[model samples]
Target: KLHVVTTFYPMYEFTKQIVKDKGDVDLLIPSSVEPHDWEPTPKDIANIQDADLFVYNSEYMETWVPSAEKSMGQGHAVFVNASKGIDLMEGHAMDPHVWLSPVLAQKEVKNITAQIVKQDPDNKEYYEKNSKEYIAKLQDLDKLYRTTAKKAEKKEFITQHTAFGYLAKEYGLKQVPIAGLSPDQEPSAASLAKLKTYAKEHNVKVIYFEEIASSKVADTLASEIGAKTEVLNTLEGLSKEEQDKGLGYIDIMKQNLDALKDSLLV
Candidate 1:
């Protein structure tokens, strides 16, 4: 069996769905940790060294992937950049959260499936079958977002971080981020003032925050604007609660659609 090492939640889930029982997949980062600020430990590096294939989103998200690749010099492991061909967004820098969009996530799954089949041609048919099935689900998710967006009352939604740019773009909606690409990047006084003004002008009623990160800024913004705080999960990693509830990528994305629908209906 092929041993696959993936960067974080999205990568792990996508690869897991594609590989199914044909191969073994392991996540490089812990499930409870936020991936943006996470650095690879020696053990993670060692995992990379031993992997038959390495899968990651991009250098934009996993800045440590290149260094790990260099350290794996002359190794037989193949590296697959899942976001290699995706048109990334330009924020403070490249936004590597391409998998946030269901359409783009299908692309990621196809790309990784190609790599996985290349690593083990014996199971090419098996991997292709699973990829087809999972991609159909993603298509349904895309249709849901499209249908929801077309009927929403408002097109603009405010978020604590800029993670949903791809998803927003896909559905023809707008996202106003309180912080930059990174969740921890604090907003400036001027930025906060501008967002507050925008929220009031647009009659925004909900402020979105992710579950894995701190909600202090979103709560503060919601209080300042008299808006309710709700979750628009980035799915970077699953929380203990989410894990206990047995939620995966598709399940959480559906919840995101429900939350978005609720927020925009007003």
Candidate 2:
């Protein structure tokens, strides 16, 4: 059986669906924690050491990847980066969250499919079949998002942080983030002042927060703008309720669409 290890939620979900019934897979990132600031413990590093394939989104997304890859002594294990062929929007250093938009996400899935096929050449046909079906589902979701976004009365929106740049670009929406790429980066007085100015100018009525991370910044901004606050789930990790309800990546994305419709349009 092939042993696959993924860095975080989206990578885990994508690999899980593709590798279902094919082999044993493990996700290194925990569901209850923020993955951006995460570092592998000794035990976790040991797990990666034993993995047959290590799949991640991009170098920028995980700060610890280079060190981890360096320590990986067995040159036999393969490394697959999902964002290989996708055009990345200019994030802080280039948006590392390439999986946030379905348009770009489909490209990640395609890259993953090629990697899986290469790893298990005997199962090439099976991988191809799963990839085709999954791509169809993704395309359907893309259409739904495009339709929803196109009808939104307001094209401009606010995020807890700069993570949604790709999402905004994909759908032709405007995203104003309260914080920068790193959640821990304390917003200087100037950023808050600037954000408040933008909010008032745009007549923003809602501020969107990510579920896995704290919404304190967004909440504070909303109060200043006399706006409401709601979740635009990053799907950084699955919520207990989402897990109990058997929600997958697509399900959470649909929820995001619903939230946007409620907050941005009728």
Candidate 3:
């Protein structure tokens, strides 16, 4: 059986769905940790070293991927860059949050399946079937997002981080991010002032934050703008609670759809 090592939750979930008892798939990063600032430990490095295949989003999302690849030192593990060939968004730089968009996520799933088939060609047909099924679900999710977002009375939503740029762009909504591409990034005084003014002027009601990250920035921004706060799951990683509840990407993305509809639709 192929032993697969995925960088984080999204990759882990997608790989798990496709592999489904065909191989052993494990996550490099633990649940309940924010992936944006996460670094792999010696144990994580060893996991990659022993893996038959290593899957990661991109350098933009996992900055340490190249270093880990170098450390592997002529290992037999085949690496799959899930975000390969994706049209990344440009703002401050190329945003690695491409998987946040369901359409793009389908592409990622396909890329990952191709790698798995290459490694274990015996189960190529099975892998293709799983990939096709999952892609259909993602397409349905994309349809839901398009329908819900198209009906929004206001097309602008404020978020604590810029994680949703790809998703927003996909649905034709404007994301007013308080921070830069990184969730932990602090906004300048001028940027904060502008965001506050924009929130008030546009009657933006909710400031969205991810579950794994600190809510301080979102809370503070909400308080300053007299708005409420809610979560917009970046799907970077899962929390212990979410894990215990057995939430996957599609479940979380549906919740995100509801959250966006509630926040943006009048």
Candidate 4:
């Protein structure tokens, strides 16, 4: 049995599907924690040490990952950087949330599969078969997003933060973020004024918010503009609702698509 560990939800889901029947997969970061503020405990570090394979996005996504890597010690555990081979989407010159884009996600799946195959040559064929099938599903999802976004009355959306650059870029949509890259970071008065102006100019009726993060700013802004607030699950953390519903990455993304269609499109 192989022990495969991944970072956040996107990496967790992508790797989980690939390794589900083949071996055991564990997601290091808890489902309910945001990756930006995630710091591993001693036990969490121990888990990484015990894993035979570790897969994570860029160091930019998890600032604490480098420390975990140092403590992982010298080992044969293949550390796979899923974002290494893909074109990175810049959020704030240093933001690393590339997995939000389906095009980049397909690349991550391919990159991860290659690493897994190289690590476990005995299961090379199995990895290839699974990888190909999964990539097809992602490709279909990509097409769905493009078609749906195009059909929307407007191509622009607003987020609590600038986390959707990859998704926006892919669909040729614009994201008017309420805040900066960090969810916890507050927007300056100038930024807020800009958002208000943009919202008015675009006739935006809905402002999107994410889980485990403060929605007060967005709520206030929306109320000031007579716009409603809606959930745009960043998949940053797994809520009890999501857990109860078995909301994996694809499930949440499907929800995201529906939300986009309802709020941004119409």
TM-score of 3: 0.88
Lowest-sum lDDT 10-residue window in model 4: 178-187
Off by over 4 Å in 2: 179-197, 212-224
What are the per-model C-alpha RMSD values against the true structure? 3.1, 3.4, 3.3, 3.2
Each candidate structure's TM-score, on Cα atoms with residue i matched to residue i, is 0.89, 0.86, 0.88, 0.87
Q: After superposition, how far is residue 201 of candidate 3 from its true place, in Å?
A: 2.1
**Which 10-residue window of candidate 3 scores lowest in summed lDDT?**
179-188
Residue pairs clashing in model 1 are none
Per-model CA lDDT versus the true structure: 0.83, 0.77, 0.83, 0.76
Model 2 lDDT tens row, 1-266: 87888888898878877777786787888776788888899988877867888888888887788788888765756878898987776766777887989878888888888888888989888878888888888899999979988788788787776577788788888887764422333346777677677777787777666653346644454466566666777767887777788897799888888777766684
Q: Order of all candidates by TM-score, from best down to worst?
A: 1, 3, 4, 2
Between prediction 2 and prediction 3, the one with superior TM-score is 3
Better of 2 and 4 by lDDT: 2
- Over 1-266, each residue of candidate 4 has an lDDT whose tens digit, in order, gives 76788888788878867766887888888787778888888887777777888888888888787777776666746678888876675555565777888889899998888778887889888888888888888898899998988787688887775678788888888887754422344456777676677777788887776743356654565466566666667667788888888977777888788778867556
What lDDT would candidate 3 get against the real structure?
0.83
Error of 2 at 131 (Å): 1.2
lDDT of 4: 0.76
Q: How many backbone clashes does candidate 3 have?
A: 0
Highest TM-score scorer: 1
